[PDB]
Design a protein around this motif. Structure first.
Motif, PDB file in Angstrom:
ATOM      1  N   UNK A  56       0.812  -1.225   0.000  1.00 19.55           N
ATOM      2  CA  UNK A  56       0.000   0.000   0.000  1.00 19.55           C
ATOM      3  C   UNK A  56       0.846   1.276   0.000  1.00 19.55           C
ATOM      4  N   UNK A  57       2.064   1.203   0.516  1.00 14.38           N
ATOM      5  CA  UNK A  57       2.961   2.336   0.420  1.00 14.38           C
ATOM      6  C   UNK A  57       4.056   1.983  -0.560  1.00 14.38           C
ATOM      7  N   UNK A  58       4.078   2.667  -1.702  1.00 14.80           N
ATOM      8  CA  UNK A  58       5.083   2.389  -2.730  1.00 14.80           C
ATOM      9  C   UNK A  58       5.790   3.626  -3.296  1.00 14.80           C
ATOM     10  N   UNK A  59       5.356   4.813  -2.894  1.00 13.84           N
ATOM     11  CA  UNK A  59       6.110   6.026  -3.175  1.00 13.84           C
ATOM     12  C   UNK A  59       6.141   6.865  -1.913  1.00 13.84           C
ATOM     13  N   UNK A  60       7.326   7.313  -1.508  1.00 13.98           N
ATOM     14  CA  UNK A  60       7.468   8.241  -0.385  1.00 13.98           C
ATOM     15  C   UNK A  60       8.418   9.338  -0.835  1.00 13.98           C
ATOM     16  N   UNK A  61       8.274  10.557  -0.326  1.00 13.22           N
ATOM     17  CA  UNK A  61       9.246  11.570  -0.720  1.00 13.22           C
ATOM     18  C   UNK A  61       9.989  12.378   0.355  1.00 13.22           C
ATOM     19  N   UNK A  62       9.282  13.128   1.193  1.00 16.27           N
ATOM     20  CA  UNK A  62       9.897  14.195   2.000  1.00 16.27           C
ATOM     21  C   UNK A  62      10.038  15.353   1.054  1.00 16.27           C
ATOM     22  N   UNK A  63       8.984  16.136   0.983  1.00 17.34           N
ATOM     23  CA  UNK A  63       8.982  17.245   0.078  1.00 17.34           C
ATOM     24  C   UNK A  63      10.054  18.225   0.486  1.00 17.34           C
ATOM     25  N   UNK A  64      10.214  18.474   1.781  1.00 15.43           N
ATOM     26  CA  UNK A  64      11.134  19.536   2.167  1.00 15.43           C
ATOM     27  C   UNK A  64      12.558  19.339   1.642  1.00 15.43           C
ATOM     28  N   UNK A  65      13.074  18.133   1.783  1.00 16.69           N
ATOM     29  CA  UNK A  65      14.398  17.858   1.281  1.00 16.69           C
ATOM     30  C   UNK A  65      14.416  17.915  -0.236  1.00 16.69           C
ATOM     31  N   UNK A  66      13.367  17.389  -0.864  1.00 11.21           N
ATOM     32  CA  UNK A  66      13.262  17.441  -2.320  1.00 11.21           C
ATOM     33  C   UNK A  66      13.266  18.898  -2.781  1.00 11.21           C
ATOM     34  N   UNK A  67      12.429  19.708  -2.142  1.00  9.05           N
ATOM     35  CA  UNK A  67      12.381  21.124  -2.419  1.00  9.05           C
ATOM     36  C   UNK A  67      13.722  21.760  -2.173  1.00  9.05           C
ATOM     37  N   UNK A  68      14.328  21.464  -1.036  1.00  9.70           N
ATOM     38  CA  UNK A  68      15.642  22.021  -0.726  1.00  9.70           C
ATOM     39  C   UNK A  68      16.626  21.845  -1.849  1.00  9.70           C
ATOM     40  N   UNK A  69      16.750  20.612  -2.312  1.00 11.85           N
ATOM     41  CA  UNK A  69      17.775  20.302  -3.286  1.00 11.85           C
ATOM     42  C   UNK A  69      17.487  20.991  -4.614  1.00 11.85           C
ATOM     43  N   UNK A  70      16.226  20.954  -5.035  1.00 15.03           N
ATOM     44  CA  UNK A  70      15.812  21.671  -6.221  1.00 15.03           C
ATOM     45  C   UNK A  70      16.232  23.120  -6.074  1.00 15.03           C
ATOM     46  N   UNK A  71      16.079  23.676  -4.880  1.00 15.64           N
ATOM     47  CA  UNK A  71      16.358  25.093  -4.648  1.00 15.64           C
ATOM     48  C   UNK A  71      17.819  25.407  -4.854  1.00 15.64           C
ATOM     49  N   UNK A  72      18.662  24.399  -4.744  1.00  8.97           N
ATOM     50  CA  UNK A  72      20.055  24.629  -5.096  1.00  8.97           C
ATOM     51  C   UNK A  72      20.513  23.936  -6.397  1.00  8.97           C
ATOM     52  N   UNK A  73      19.575  23.780  -7.322  1.00 14.99           N
ATOM     53  CA  UNK A  73      19.900  23.372  -8.666  1.00 14.99           C
ATOM     54  C   UNK A  73      20.120  21.893  -8.797  1.00 14.99           C
ATOM     55  N   UNK A  74      19.548  21.124  -7.891  1.00 11.39           N
ATOM     56  CA  UNK A  74      19.453  19.715  -8.174  1.00 11.39           C
ATOM     57  C   UNK A  74      18.540  19.653  -9.389  1.00 11.39           C
ATOM     58  N   UNK A  75      18.842  18.749 -10.307  1.00 16.31           N
ATOM     59  CA  UNK A  75      18.058  18.634 -11.512  1.00 16.31           C
ATOM     60  C   UNK A  75      17.515  17.220 -11.580  1.00 16.31           C
TER      61      UNK A  75
END
Ligand SMILES: [Mg+2]
Ligand SMILES: [Mg+2]
Ligand SMILES: [Mg+2]
Ligand SMILES: [Mg+2]
Ligand SMILES: [Mg+2]
Ligand SMILES: [Mg+2]
Ligand SMILES: [Mg+2]
Ligand SMILES: [Mg+2]
Ligand SMILES: [Mg+2]
Ligand SMILES: [Mg+2]
Ligand SMILES: [Mg+2]
Ligand SMILES: [Mg+2]
Ligand SMILES: [Mg+2]
Ligand SMILES: [Mg+2]
Ligand SMILES: [Mg+2]
Ligand SMILES: [Mg+2]
Ligand SMILES: [Mg+2]
Ligand SMILES: [Mg+2]
Ligand SMILES: [Mg+2]
Ligand SMILES: [Mg+2]
Ligand SMILES: [Mg+2]
Ligand SMILES: [Mg+2]
Ligand SMILES: [Mg+2]
Ligand SMILES: [Mg+2]
Ligand SMILES: [Mg+2]
Ligand SMILES: [Mg+2]
Ligand SMILES: [Mg+2]
Ligand SMILES: [Mg+2]
Ligand SMILES: [Mg+2]
Ligand SMILES: [Mg+2]
Ligand SMILES: [Mg+2]
Ligand SMILES: [Mg+2]
Ligand SMILES: [Mg+2]
Ligand SMILES: [Mg+2]
Ligand SMILES: [Mg+2]
Ligand SMILES: [Mg+2]
Ligand SMILES: [Mg+2]
Ligand SMILES: [Mg+2]
Ligand SMILES: [Mg+2]
Ligand SMILES: [Mg+2]
Ligand SMILES: [Mg+2]
Ligand SMILES: [Mg+2]
Ligand SMILES: [Mg+2]
Ligand SMILES: [Mg+2]
Ligand SMILES: [Mg+2]
Ligand SMILES: [Mg+2]
Ligand SMILES: [Mg+2]
Ligand SMILES: [Mg+2]
Ligand SMILES: [Mg+2]
Ligand SMILES: [Mg+2]
Ligand SMILES: [Mg+2]
Ligand SMILES: [Mg+2]
Ligand SMILES: [Mg+2]
Ligand SMILES: [Mg+2]
Ligand SMILES: [Mg+2]
Ligand SMILES: [Mg+2]
Ligand SMILES: [Mg+2]
Ligand SMILES: [Mg+2]
Ligand SMILES: [Mg+2]
Ligand SMILES: [Mg+2]
Ligand SMILES: [Mg+2]
Ligand SMILES: [Mg+2]
Ligand SMILES: [Mg+2]
Ligand SMILES: [Mg+2]
Ligand SMILES: [Mg+2]
Ligand SMILES: [Mg+2]
Ligand SMILES: [Mg+2]
Ligand SMILES: [Mg+2]
Ligand SMILES: [Mg+2]
Ligand SMILES: [Mg+2]
Lengths: 83, 99, 104
Positions: A46-65
């Motif tokens: 039942x759980x097959x995708x998890x993220x943690x938006x904050x870290x995802x957002x963080x990295x994007x914010x420093x040009x993670x692509x």
RNA sequence: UGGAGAGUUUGAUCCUGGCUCAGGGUGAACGCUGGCGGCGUGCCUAAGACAUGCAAGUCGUGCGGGCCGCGGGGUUUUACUCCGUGGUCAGCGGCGGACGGGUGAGUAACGCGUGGGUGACCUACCCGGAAGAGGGGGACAACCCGGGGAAACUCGGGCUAAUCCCCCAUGUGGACCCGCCCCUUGGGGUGUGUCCAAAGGGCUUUGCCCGCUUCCGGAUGGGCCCGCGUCCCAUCAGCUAGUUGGUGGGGUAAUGGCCCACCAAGGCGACGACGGGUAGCCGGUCUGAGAGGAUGGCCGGCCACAGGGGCACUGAGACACGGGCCCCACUCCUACGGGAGGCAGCAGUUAGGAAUCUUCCGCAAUGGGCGCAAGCCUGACGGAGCGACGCCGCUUGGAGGAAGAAGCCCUUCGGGGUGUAAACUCCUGAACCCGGGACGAAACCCCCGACGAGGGGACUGACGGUACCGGGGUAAUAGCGCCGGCCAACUCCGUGCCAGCAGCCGCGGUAAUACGGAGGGCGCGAGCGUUACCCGGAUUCACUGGGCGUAAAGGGCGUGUAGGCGGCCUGGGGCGUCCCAUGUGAAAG
């Protein structure tokens, strides 16, 4: 350039990806900077995708692509959604 | 046989020259500038010293020099010139130096 | 933190450079007994200031030569020639221990 | 949460002591045997040599063309000549080729580990912020002409575009000298002087998309320096001349004897320098009660190497595996002058060896490179293939069946054994046949919205007609080791110190539970044995955890250097020692 992409972690015929940030020149399954989620494609649980938006957002914010796939998964877990 | 990215080698040579020459000009202009100051001829001296300062800063626009390689080449040159004029001079044209 | 050792100058027969000797008490891995153990550092004495017998603190620094990676940070106590003599006999002994010749 | 011992020195005993066995482990090989699957794993030797194919390119949205088409123009017509468009080929230019994949030869080293430093530094592409792109000139390939060479290839002559190169400008700002402030290593301001910018392309064509330039910051990746840790030999005790430091230079992104000139005469060593031997290091792995011992194979991190030895060029990055030069060795072409190679990338061949796989399928997934995109390229990779090589799962049937067939075995001649085993009765139904048939795949793209958020749509599967589900359905592989003690399991025959066995003690000399066969028995079982190696038992290098009167071991005796150790009372310090908090201890295991 640092990526946000799926590192391969299942076993034969049983794939589990581990969504990670890493320098784009690392081998696919090698040393990464940070895991920020996982994803089983075969939806075996039942759980097959998890993220943690904050870290995802963080990295994007420093040009993670994000690879065109990690972005799909990122989007789907509401990483982008601003409304 | 054949790997058409020996184009790269081909063009490396082309560059080997652009750089090679640029550098040559700096070295011979610098020496010259420093020779004009060991004879204490400050009018001509700075006038060249300045042309070579330029030649450096310019070389570092593209890949010939870059960074602080240039900035080195610059001071090491600018330094030696003021000092050789300190040995009796009075910076006439005083182009590329601070009051 | 730039590492800081305290030592004894056993040599200033060298332009602008001291040889500080630093010791370290520690319990031995297998056998547990405490063993002393010491190492010579070359320290930068730019103003030929400190002289042998001085006890000085030595500071981790951007390299001045090979061998030379510390600068003498400050003076602790002075004059104590016991350790200098201590260190000096230590090497005078080497005269024997050989095959050749020399009263140790 | 964790600790087992035994056999063997004697007529017997206690002890000392070595040898041996019982356990675990394997990238194994060997013998006998061999049925299905999943997941792993597979040159330990020659870092020997390599046939053939494939393995790094991409962009027409940077530029100008050559060849082959098709179509439309200028003239009454021809000639010549202008424009459009399809395909193709390389050239100039940009980014990639420094990753990804391979190996462990070298290396005992700041190589690796771990903790720190950098006021001594670099960082293409990516993110954020500030400001900008005005004018002008140039060349070289392509193409055209000519020459040399067998060939690799090569020289000369003439055109030419650009996001190629250059000069001037603007100077947000940056760089350099000198001065001043703060800071304290070269960090951060500030003033005069000097120096330094840019590139265009695309359209849904006045505005967007992708680019370019300078500066500041971030992110990520690196360089360099330091403390401590990192095998064996002292039958290797002395070692060093860029050697050790200084000044000034050169060099670099940057410190540094990194290199150079001059000056001083230093530096290292019994805490093991110098030399020799061996070795990639780590996370980990095996073993062990633990302390320890052994190891570094799969996987992940770092380092090193790309036939051997040097070297630089180009770049943000290389001293560059599928780039350049030179010397060496080897194979190949050769018109004798000359050229061409480099699997320790994927497969594969050959050699060596006890021994180690397919010249397979696919870019569908993940990841990478370039491209605005569509795409292209990926032997990275995802899969299949071979091998019991390893783990795990599964079958060779299940219930009944004699007071107990036959044969073979033993016997006290009564019997006893194989043994419910078989036969045989019924019951399920591996193999095999038929039908359905996947998950892995939703993004890129396209449409609405705004090219955002958001919503709608379409395409895509190598594995694979596989996994799995449904129906049909046959009683349908068993081996190998052992049976004197250690060590579970004894009886006949044959042999006669022979033939043989044997891990150790030991068996065999005519009544052998020890040799060879048989019946029976014990142990495992798609395996069972063997050999090799590591830890264990081995307190048998003993720190935990040993000894030296006679078992091995007190130096022939002193004097004494270093070193180790050191009585009672008080005070300071806080190195050792203890405590609290906090950072680090990646993932895998
Ligand atoms: Mg000249
Ligand atoms: Mg005896
Ligand atoms: Mg006996
Ligand atoms: Mg014994
Ligand atoms: Mg066989
Ligand atoms: Mg397999
Ligand atoms: Mg090998
Ligand atoms: Mg070949
Ligand atoms: Mg291919
Ligand atoms: Mg082309
Ligand atoms: Mg590599
Ligand atoms: Mg050595
Ligand atoms: Mg180093
Ligand atoms: Mg730093
Ligand atoms: Mg910006
Ligand atoms: Mg023009
Ligand atoms: Mg022409
Ligand atoms: Mg020409
Ligand atoms: Mg022209
Ligand atoms: Mg300015
Ligand atoms: Mg200014
Ligand atoms: Mg200062
Ligand atoms: Mg200043
Ligand atoms: Mg200008
Ligand atoms: Mg425009
Ligand atoms: Mg950084
Ligand atoms: Mg000297
Ligand atoms: Mg220097
Ligand atoms: Mg120097
Ligand atoms: Mg040595
Ligand atoms: Mg090695
Ligand atoms: Mg270890
Ligand atoms: Mg033990
Ligand atoms: Mg291996
Ligand atoms: Mg390995
Ligand atoms: Mg080879
Ligand atoms: Mg360069
Ligand atoms: Mg190759
Ligand atoms: Mg052979
Ligand atoms: Mg792909
Ligand atoms: Mg892809
Ligand atoms: Mg039965
Ligand atoms: Mg049935
Ligand atoms: Mg039936
Ligand atoms: Mg696609
Ligand atoms: Mg629209
Ligand atoms: Mg959308
Ligand atoms: Mg049967
Ligand atoms: Mg028994
Ligand atoms: Mg009988
Ligand atoms: Mg016989
Ligand atoms: Mg007999
Ligand atoms: Mg007998
Ligand atoms: Mg027998
Ligand atoms: Mg026996
Ligand atoms: Mg045990
Ligand atoms: Mg032991
Ligand atoms: Mg003993
Ligand atoms: Mg005796
Ligand atoms: Mg004795
Ligand atoms: Mg005695
Ligand atoms: Mg004697
Ligand atoms: Mg004696
Ligand atoms: Mg005595
Ligand atoms: Mg004493
Ligand atoms: Mg004492
Ligand atoms: Mg005491
Ligand atoms: Mg006290
Ligand atoms: Mg303390
Ligand atoms: Mg961990």
């Amino acid at each position: 350039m640092v990526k946000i992409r799926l590192a391969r972690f299942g076993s034969k015929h049983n794939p589990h990806y581990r969504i990670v940030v890493t320098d784009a020149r690392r081998k696919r399954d090698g040393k990464y900077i940070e895991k920020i989620g996982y994803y089983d494609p075969r939806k075996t649980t039942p759980d097959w995708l998890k993220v943690d938006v904050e870290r995802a957002r963080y990295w994007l914010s420093v040009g993670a692509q994000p690879t065109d796939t990690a972005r799909r998964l990122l989007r789907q877990a509401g990483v982008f959604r601003q409304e | 046989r054949n790997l058409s990215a020996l184009k790269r080698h081909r063009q490396s040579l082309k560059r080997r020259l652009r750089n090679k020459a640029k550098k040559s000009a700096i070295k011979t202009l610098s020496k010259k500038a420093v020779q004009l100051a060991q004879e204490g001829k400050a009018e001509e001296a700075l006038k060249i010293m300045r042309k070579a300062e330029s030649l450096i800063d310019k070389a570092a626009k593209g890949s010939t020099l870059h960074k602080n390689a240039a900035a080195r080449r610059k001071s090491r040159l600018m330094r030696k010139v003021r000092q050789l004029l300190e040995a009796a001079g009075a910076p006439l044209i005083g182009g590329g130096l601070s009051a | 933190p730039k590492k800081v050792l305290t030592g004894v100058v056993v040599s200033d027969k060298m332009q602008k450079t001291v040889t500080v000797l630093v010791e370290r008490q520690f319990p031995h891995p297998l056998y547990g007994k405490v063993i002393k153990r010491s190492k010579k550092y070359l320290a930068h004495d730019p103003e030929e200031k400190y002289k042998l017998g001085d006890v000085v603190e030595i500071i981790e620094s951007r390299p001045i030569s090979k061998r030379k990676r510390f600068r003498v940070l400050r003076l602790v106590e002075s004059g104590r020639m016991d350790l200098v003599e201590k260190y000096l006999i230590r090497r005078q002994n080497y005269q024997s221990l050989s095959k050749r010749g020399g009263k140790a």
